[model samples]
Target: KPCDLPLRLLVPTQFVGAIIGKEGATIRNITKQTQSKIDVHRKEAAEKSITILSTPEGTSAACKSILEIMHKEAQDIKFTEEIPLKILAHNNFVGRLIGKEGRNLKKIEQDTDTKITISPLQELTLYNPERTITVKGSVETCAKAEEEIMKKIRESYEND
Candidate 1:
């Protein structure tokens, strides 16, 4: 089923054994059943957890099952708050923000804990020179990310 809401799932360390199962069979089964992408971090001394990037529908069932399974197996888990942001800027600024090889944009996204998208239409409309950038996650994260993006824009235009 397609997802309705967006959710990020965090797996616990103790339950990692059960979640991974023998030869990764358990995780495989969960993926197949939920049709959600599951990524498990490497096992380390610290608590290793699984990240589930899924839409509401895809993860609803999977999350329930995972919780039950974890309870049965005794594991701990925590999820970070997701943040979303949207920015609208001039075309020239957008181009500069993207930078060479999109490095600048990538750096902003990484630092801000958000993703940025510039519309293709805006990309071609040099006359318009206006763009809308969006990032999604938690409120605080989104705000901080936007602040950084705005800062970048100021820095780029302030001296230019």
Candidate 2:
């Protein structure tokens, strides 16, 4: 089971515990079910990533499983929330990622039916020079928005 690189998705840290499940039962189940190596890593960016180093055949379903479990954990706070897709990017690309008047992001939100919001600096110690973009939509829709965000990120990289 080898892939050039793992497929990475930014996930909020608050909800990871449940995804790992009580006593790791949840992830244990997805292991037998998805059979993809869905490993979560903590890198002090106020977020964690679910990295799957496996074939797409299994990792794709593992992604949905992560979202599905996140959905289950998303309780008590009822705002008809869409499963948010989080993205981590350097501040250099973040400015252009927003574009002028945020017009660029508006298009992404409209097209993907997602509500896109970027995290504030929250950089007291100046640890990580990055921001988290929260794209609110259904799991599938958010995934769609994820690529769009990366599109701008890449575009920024090319231009500058």
Candidate 3:
């Protein structure tokens, strides 16, 4: 067992439907099998993206299991990029990026090879005075991802 090791999983939104099961039973089963903690989060103003965090062992095992599940769902997947960033943004927009059913964020994760995160509201003010959006991945991937996410935010904010 490796302590302090981390693994992050990015899956597409369309695939989430198969992973969540009826009333979260599917996800609960995965956590139980891997003995890892898992949560889904949305990015600001972006659709179909999610952040999956797990312990190293859990992450490794979960990745395999997740991929298998996706295969069953006929979703295509591949390794892309890996980078870490932190951002803050309006809670409502973050919720939307995660999608009504978390479908949108999943797609971005699948296509872009990146991860997106929106800080919690209570933690936001303690950390930063203003809203933010964080994009992380390989240097090239992250840069591209950042551009895509910023475009979404600009569009949403401008319209609002």
Candidate 4:
């Protein structure tokens, strides 16, 4: 386990239909098999979050099943292109990842050969404080950045 629970990812709206699966049976079985709790959330846009909150093992396990489902659906629809990784992190942790003058993110892009974009805060709502970090790269490139970003977040998690 690299970090804590409540890991979140943004998924295509259509992909979510597959995640929910056969009137919710698919999500049910994954939660049962992985021993994880998953809650799918909707956005006003064409994307949403399949939020996994549980122990690290269960969380990642459930994640794999969802990704597999999404991949199958994408291939079925002939949308078998690249899918960027969109992760959600709280506002409390991303500032340092941004670094003093954005050097931290710059380093990640250079080191991982990925373009990472932190979504703007204009989506701020009444009680929502989550932000999106969108990463563009090959699978392996995103994998390394995922660790780099999570390291920073886990380190900062102890601060408050």
Model 2 lDDT tens row, 1-160: 2434445678768788888978889988987887777777645445677766555556556767787778777764452555577666777777677889998889888888989998787752377676667777888777667667766776676676
RMSD of each: 14.3, 5.1, 13.6, 3.4
Which prediction has more favorable TM-score, 2 or 3? 2
Per-model TM-score, in order, reads 0.43, 0.60, 0.40, 0.73
Q: Backbone clashes per model, in order?
A: 12, 0, 13, 0
lDDT of 1 by residue, 1-160 (tens): 4322223333446566777789988888888988888776685423443445564445545555565565556423453332123345655565667889989888877886776777675355636555556666444455555555655665555545
What is the lDDT for 20 in model 1? Answer: 76
Error of 2 at 94 (Å): 1.8
Regarding TM-score, does 1 or 2 come out ahead? 2
**Cα lDDT of model 4 by residue, 11-73, tens digit:** 878788888888799999999998887888655468888677766557656766776787778
Cα deviation of 114 in candidate 4 (Å)?
3.3
lDDT of 3 by residue, 1-160 (tens): 2333223334555566677778989888998988877666544222243333455445545555665565566523453332243333454445445666757666666667987655545666554443445555654455445444544444444454
Better of 2 and 4 by TM-score: 4
Off by over 4 Å in 1: 1-84, 121-127
Worst 10 residues of 4 by lDDT: 151-160
Which model is ahead, 1 or 2, in terms of lDDT? 2
State how far residue 99 of model 4 sits from its true place (Å).
2.9
Give the best candidate by lDDT.
4
Off by over 4 Å in 3: 1-5, 42-55, 75-160
Residue 94 local lDDT, model 1? 56
**Rank by TM-score (best first):** 4, 2, 1, 3
